[PDB]
Scaffold this active site. Structure first.
Site, PDB file in Angstrom:
ATOM      1  N   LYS A 120       0.943  -1.197  -0.081  1.00 46.22           N
ATOM      2  CA  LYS A 120       0.011  -0.179  -0.120  1.00 46.22           C
ATOM      3  C   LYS A 120       1.039   1.387   0.152  1.00 46.22           C
ATOM      4  CE  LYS A 120      -3.542  -0.322   2.607  1.00 46.22           C
ATOM      5  NZ  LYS A 120      -4.343  -0.394   3.885  1.00 46.22           N
TER       6      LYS A 120
ATOM      7  N   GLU B  29      -2.425   8.183  13.361  1.00 45.16           N
ATOM      8  CA  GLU B  29      -1.577   7.339  12.976  1.00 45.16           C
ATOM      9  C   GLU B  29      -1.116   6.708  14.147  1.00 45.16           C
ATOM     10  OE1 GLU B  29      -0.184   5.758  10.627  1.00 45.16           O
ATOM     11  OE2 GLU B  29       1.336   6.911   9.442  1.00 45.16           O
ATOM     12  N   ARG B  30      -0.244   5.383  13.867  1.00 44.98           N
ATOM     13  CA  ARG B  30       0.520   5.037  14.994  1.00 44.98           C
ATOM     14  C   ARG B  30       2.044   5.437  14.788  1.00 44.98           C
ATOM     15  NH1 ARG B  30      -2.279  -0.843  14.327  1.00 44.98           N
ATOM     16  NH2 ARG B  30      -2.314  -0.175  12.443  1.00 44.98           N
TER      17      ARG B  30
HETATM   18  N1  ADP Z   1       7.374  -2.671  -7.869  1.00 48.15           N
HETATM   19  C1  ADP Z   1       7.752  -3.556  -6.990  1.00 48.15           C
HETATM   20  N2  ADP Z   1       8.686  -4.507  -7.163  1.00 48.15           N
HETATM   21  C2  ADP Z   1       9.267  -5.341  -6.059  1.00 48.15           C
HETATM   22  N3  ADP Z   1       8.641  -5.458  -4.856  1.00 48.15           N
HETATM   23  C3  ADP Z   1       7.530  -4.529  -4.481  1.00 48.15           C
HETATM   24  C4  ADP Z   1       7.166  -3.690  -5.655  1.00 48.15           C
HETATM   25  N4  ADP Z   1       6.219  -2.960  -5.301  1.00 48.15           N
HETATM   26  C5  ADP Z   1       5.684  -3.426  -3.730  1.00 48.15           C
HETATM   27  N5  ADP Z   1       6.789  -4.432  -3.439  1.00 48.15           N
HETATM   28  C6  ADP Z   1       6.784  -5.187  -2.217  1.00 48.15           C
HETATM   29  O1  ADP Z   1       6.252  -4.521  -1.130  1.00 48.15           O
HETATM   30  C7  ADP Z   1       6.500  -5.216   0.141  1.00 48.15           C
HETATM   31  C8  ADP Z   1       6.423  -4.549   1.263  1.00 48.15           C
HETATM   32  O2  ADP Z   1       5.052  -3.871   1.311  1.00 48.15           O
HETATM   33  P1  ADP Z   1       4.942  -2.393   2.073  1.00 48.15           P
HETATM   34  O3  ADP Z   1       4.110  -1.544   1.080  1.00 48.15           O
HETATM   35  O4  ADP Z   1       6.124  -2.053   2.747  1.00 48.15           O
HETATM   36  O5  ADP Z   1       3.770  -2.982   3.148  1.00 48.15           O
HETATM   37  P2  ADP Z   1       3.049  -1.903   4.028  1.00 48.15           P
HETATM   38  O6  ADP Z   1       1.308  -1.960   3.819  1.00 48.15           O
HETATM   39  O7  ADP Z   1       3.304  -2.376   5.389  1.00 48.15           O
HETATM   40  O8  ADP Z   1       3.458  -0.446   3.657  1.00 48.15           O
HETATM   41  C9  ADP Z   1       8.105  -5.559  -0.415  1.00 48.15           C
HETATM   42  O9  ADP Z   1       8.457  -6.797   0.091  1.00 48.15           O
HETATM   43  C10 ADP Z   1       8.420  -5.339  -1.626  1.00 48.15           C
HETATM   44  O10 ADP Z   1       9.015  -6.503  -2.332  1.00 48.15           O
END
Ligand code: ADP
Ligand code: ATP
Ligand code: MG
Lengths: 458, 55, 85, 115, 85, 85, 460
Positions: free
Chosen positions: G156, G182-183
């Protein structure tokens, strides 16, 4: 003499000199611009303040207006002078004809007849409708209630009952429109005038456009007229267009009257307010009132306090189901919930009673099987369970019937069915005499002969 | 004949069980709508009792 | 003694309590509705002969009196969880 | 009897009706209501009664308490609250009692600290 | 005349009613909620020529006036059985 | 840090609020019941070395600090959608 | 000169009495000296007799009866403009980072009327995001409200950073992020990740932490929206991120309960619909420019009929669903093309080519999800040579939905791609029409546009 001191919605408080405070249910009068407004006294507060409900629109009222104290309750014309005319809650003529040639006026607030005066009767009254007089037959001088949600056929059923009963019956009739559609009142008025039966009917109309006080008191006005005809010694038919609106008009004003809410927000006085109205609709050793009432069920909730309270007051109850109506089975009577005091072997006799209980048992068993059928399908059933289902479905179809007032909706001619044909037909279906016909043969046929003739052409 | 009937039996069972799975899904969605109504109603009813009890 | 519709006794009592502005409890009934029905129904009893002799001042001796109550309650949909039931 | 140093048994016919009497009086004592009609002080009243029924170094009180469960809803605040104060809890279920198999103890709901 | 989302008019009236401390009924709508919608729609009608002649003071004769109405209501989850619907 | 039965803390705070005649919310909990647990639990934190250095006036320099919280909540019938849970 | 005095303190609620002639108006802001720090109070109601009732924008502890009160005659005013970019602020517009004073040029009141009927634009225009799945299957309008329904682990925040980056670089707009409840840990993590991505200069952050009293968490959304309206007036097109609209609703419920208003159905405030409308109607496309909003949505019991979802959905234009099942395939962005929807996807708005392309992709993926059941229950032998064709094309369509982000380069190790709407339409139309049928399905994964898939296949 009086002064207005508060105006809150439909409720008006009036102050009087302490030596002259009006009695409860006295009528007061105030000039509101270019018209006269009646107020009915509900409560005496302290210090000569009195709390009243407006029999009309309360908009435009100021504080400080002078109020006139009429020395009597609301009194309405009664007798044959009311026959053939449309009247308001205040007993005023609402048709464009002249004044009502009254000879007497009665206060609409009255006591019910004493226990000594009441009379029993077991004379079964026939109807043209298969399901009603099969499952929930009713007697001359009894009460019938049509329970249903919005748009399931209370009015259409009541109009068929009018057509059949109030035209094979010879005496006078009173129709009370309480908080229902004005269009339907006009339509009823005309088709009465075109049939030249209007001169037997008194009509009091308190429809939804009216402010709450009118919808509250109009039912009592209608009962007062019906009581005049009963006490004259006649046999009278009283039709009430929707009894629920009376309780709802109580609910609307109860909070403004300063009364704590109860249950689902209803007025605390719900049972007493309904009971004092209902107890006056009674046949008596001097004369008999036969009553048919529509009872709206809010949100289809039959466990709501208003329907629940209404159930105890009626002799025959017909419950209309939205789930059946959406199948297109009309009239949408639920035979597992409809019931009558008259379904008793002594009054109806054994064949009718046995047929009714057989139909009831088969339909109950079908309800028990439907939850199996929903998940597994019918193929898992036993060969006797499949026969139970095959007969129950035909029974459900055979309870349907074309109505004359439903000629405009269906396009097919209405049917009148004698009770003997109903008993014979359902007994034949349950005995399996017709196990070889398809289900479609039974839908919307008047009699079993018509089922077999329909079956020949499928 | 016996073997071909056995193949017929397993095919018919697969078809019927597929129909059963779909019908169960329909029943679940209906029941969940009823449940959400009951939940919301109970909350509103008891909260009305509480607020009207502050008198 | 057959009390018919003890529930309607409860409803009339609720009307009285709300018109007297007493605080509503659960399901808008007053709290002491239990005390109402319990003190009504605890009168139905079988009394030993000694109580009868004391009450009658010795006119009746050796006889035990009894009052049997058969109250009636209406449930709305088999819901036994309502307050009065 | 405990402070004398004796070992005594205490039987309570129904703990629930104490809380129910509290509910009766609470509205007239001017308290605003909470939860399902119950008094706000429900946990305080329950704890103040229950914390006296204990075995000290001088003497022991063994107690058996019957607890009414309204409509068998073990969710209801009074039984749910009293669950925390006991050591062994035996749950009698109408689901079993309907089969007539008394004592009707539910093994999947009953439990004890000693097990 | 089209009324779009009489449900939203009901929500607005409920806001006004609860801010005025008026006891809510089923759901949270005031008991007035039926009268609210009823006095609006009931205005729509086909009036006979005599009414038109009386209102116009005789300027228009023999014509029947009319007002059709199409109210719109929104149901949650297709539930036709809710209070306002 | 382990907080045993935060639901009991919420019940105690509800008792305090209702005896102090503060307006009730859902399930009779006061309006700020969320604020109670939120401002309790946000204290559980890990803080960077510069915060520790500033707080201790430099007597501890290289260390971060942390407080880890394990609150306990009791659901009634798996109803995770109850207010406090 | 202070002119009022505190007369009650009941939790967060503070009542202040003024002279009869100088009662502050509703929504005005007061301040008091709580010992050695200033506490701001916002007016909610004017009671009779000069008494006014307020919600404390801070900790209420330590307040005495009789303290002097200063009547600031404006509402809460916050700094706006370029100086806000890259800075973290609280609801009062005070810097929560340690990075010194904000070089403000103006301060705007956070309470405003929405644009009038004559100020609203006379057009409907799509905001080209550059993301294939969003631009094809769930197109944003300028001035639209967009809901994100994904859970956690689904990418997200990386999606949010990609939108921020593209709107700052490929358009010429700016972003505002409003952390409604927020947290604090997650706010710190998000701040550092935006620093590491180098998108921090492009976005302004207003944070309302959960430890804050309810008034702060209620009003922080309006603060962020006010900064967005400032950037809009400059003529730019802007993104506004609301981190959970549900917590805005709950803050309204808490505040109204503390004020003691009569609650509504399911216990919400009676003002629920108007509070939602007061927020959402300010986010529109003016003739001057537009604010477009991406809003995280939470469903209170997975009950879609609950009043908070029911009110929110009436204002959303588009819904984007992120699923961990797609993330299990390694496809990123992990957007479900069948459950994501956009009401802009109509022929009269996007045109017949776009509509037909999106409908075709939807039908093919639905059919593939049906045929997966047959492939499991009966196997590939059952599958006809036409059904094999739709499977072979559905795999390629599904992989062509993948796209490398400029902000994900540290994960993928491949430079990001921005794809124009015409190019993504052309690519999916191409695959559907059966040209490019002959390429390997891995030629489509993470490639970009179709003109780069043909380059990848030449060496794959
Ligand atoms: N374009 C992309 N290429 C590779 N991995 C991606 C890409 N977009 C998202 N990810 C993956 O998103 C994961 C983390 O999700 P994140 O958005 O940090 O979760 P949250 O909802 O906690 O923010 C990572 O493991 C990453 O590999
Ligand atoms: N016997 C019937 N045959 C065919 N259609 C019928 C029949 N009874 C009712 N209906 C259908 O149902 C519609 C509503 O009927 P009706 O006006 O009697 O309902 P109601 O329950 O009294 O409604 P309301 O509560 O709105 O006054 C009719 O206009 C017609 O379409
Ligand atoms: Mg009708």
């Amino acid at each position: 003499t009086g002064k207005i001191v508060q105006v809150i919605g439909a409720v008006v408080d009036v102050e009087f000199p302490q030596d002259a405070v009006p009695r409860v249910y006295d009528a007061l009068e105030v000039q509101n611009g270019n018209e006269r407004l009646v107020l009915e006294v509900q409560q005496q507060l302290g210090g000569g303040i009195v709390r009243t409900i407006a029999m009309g629109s309360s908009d435009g009222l100021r504080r400080g207006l002078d109020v006139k104290d009429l020395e009597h309750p609301i009194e309405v014309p009664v007798g044959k002078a009311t026959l053939g005319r449309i009247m308001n809650v205040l007993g005023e003529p609402v048709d464009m004809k002249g004044e009502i040639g009254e000879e007497e006026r009665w206060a609409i607030h009255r006591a019910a007849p004493s226990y000594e005066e009441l009379s029993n009767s077991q004379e079964l009254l026939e109807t043209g409708i298969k399901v009603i007089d099969l499952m929930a037959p009713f007697a001359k001088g009894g009460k019938v209630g049509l329970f249903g949600g919005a748009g399931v056929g209370k009015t259409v059923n009541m109009m068929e009952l009018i057509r059949n009963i109030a035209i094979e019956h010879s005496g006078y009739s009173v129709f009370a429109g309480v908080g229902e559609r004005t269009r339907e009142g006009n339509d009823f008025y005309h088709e009465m005038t075109d049939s030249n039966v209007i001169d037997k009917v008194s009509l009091v109309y308190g429809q939804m456009n009216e402010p709450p006080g009118n919808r509250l008191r109009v039912a009592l006005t209608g009962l007062t007229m019906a009581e005049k005809f009963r006490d004259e010694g006649r046999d009278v038919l009283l039709f009430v267009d929707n009894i629920y609106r009376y309780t709802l008009a109580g609910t609307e004003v109860s909070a403004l009257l300063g009364r704590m809410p109860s249950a689902v927000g209803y007025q605390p006085t719900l049972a007493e307010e309904m009971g004092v109205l209902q107890e006056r609709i009674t046949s008596t050793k001097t004369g008999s009132i036969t009553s048919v009432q529509a009872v709206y069920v809010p949100a289809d909730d039959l466990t709501d306090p208003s329907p629940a309270t209404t159930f105890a007051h009626l002799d025959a109850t017909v419950v209309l189901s939205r789930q059946i109506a959406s199948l297109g089975i009309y009239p949408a009577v639920d035979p597992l919930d409809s019931t009558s005091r008259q379904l008793d072997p002594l009054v109806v006799g054994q064949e009718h009673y046995d047929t009714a209980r057989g139909v009831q048992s088969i339909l109950q068993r079908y309800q028990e099987l439907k939850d199996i059928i929903a998940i597994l399908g019918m193929d898992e059933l036993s060969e006797e369970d499949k026969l139970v289902v095959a007969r129950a479905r035909k029974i459900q179809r055979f309870l349907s019937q074309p109505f004359f007032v439903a000629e405009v909706f269906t396009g097919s001619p209405g049917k009148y069915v004698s009770l003997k044909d109903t008993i014979r037909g359902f007994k034949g279906i349950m005995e399996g005499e017709y196990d070889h016909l398809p289900e479609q043969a039974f839908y919307m046929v008047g009699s079993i002969e018509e089922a077999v003739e329909k079956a020949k052409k499928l | 004949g016996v073997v071909e009937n056995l193949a017929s039996e397993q095919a018919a069972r697969m078809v019927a069980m597929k129909a059963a799975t779909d019908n169960g899904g329909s029943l679940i969605k209906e029941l969940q709508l009823v449940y959400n109504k009951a939940r919301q109603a109970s909350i509103t009813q008891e909260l009305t009792e509480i607020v009207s009890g502050a008198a | 003694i057959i009390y018919d519709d003890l529930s309607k006794q409860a409803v009339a009592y609720r009307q009285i309590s709300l018109l007297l502005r007493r605080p509503p409890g659960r399901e808008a009934f007053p709290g002491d509705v239990f005390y109402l029905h319990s003190r009504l129904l605890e009168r139905a009893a079988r009394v030993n002969a000694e109580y009868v002799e004391a009450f009658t001042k010795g006119e009746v001796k050796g006889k035990t009196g009894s009052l049997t109550a058969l109250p009636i309650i209406e449930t709305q949909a088999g819901d036994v969880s309502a307050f009065v039931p």
